[PDB]
Amino acid sequence: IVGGYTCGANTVPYQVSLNSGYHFCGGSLINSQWVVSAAHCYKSGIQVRLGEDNINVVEGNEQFISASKSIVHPSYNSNTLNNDIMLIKLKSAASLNSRVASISLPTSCASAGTQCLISGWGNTKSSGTSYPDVLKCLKAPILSDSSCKSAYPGQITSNMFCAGYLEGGKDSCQGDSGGPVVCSGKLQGIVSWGSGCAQKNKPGVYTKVCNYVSWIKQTIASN
Ligand SMILES: NCc1csc(-c2cccs2)n1
Ligand SMILES: [Ca+2]
To answer: What's the rounded Cα separation, in Å, for the pair 80 and 83?
Structure first.
């Protein structure tokens, strides 16, 4: 997260870190045994880390649970990043509490202008590289479809939305990938892509989660 703020330990209780020897992506806990992330975060050997603030220090609220299976969306295209969504099942159910909690799926799509919370352990620099240990947060509005399409000609599908600031300075970045965009207590987006970070006229692009609720529910119901 570039130009954000330190969230505070366990203030974003649905935020997960995906770890394969190191943090490589964010995710969102949607029930005791399932995590939503980006399809571009797919790899083998994933351990889900819940209750994290400082990802380099065991602070006492963590739960570390290996993934039993990952399910990339059947229509995910890695070139265009269309349908950039994946489900991860935990080998055992997380113990839910005030610091490790699920986030609700949307019942409706959030509109442009809606104010949301984006979070992650991604790069905090727009030019350099600096990775934080503690969770960073950014309040950002959803942008209009037209402004999103004008920012990225030929690249925005009906499964994507832009959020952030056209002036730059405040954005998600590498390592925030797969993490949450939450609006009114619902998971509306997944950190998907962009062009650099916090650059003028290049806001973050996010997977439009409301399009996938039926797939998520049916997949969970049979897996
Ligand atoms: N600025 C949006 C965004 C989200 S993930 C991301 C990057 C991934 C790799 C380099 S940059 N950029
Ligand atoms: Ca920790």
So the answer is: 9
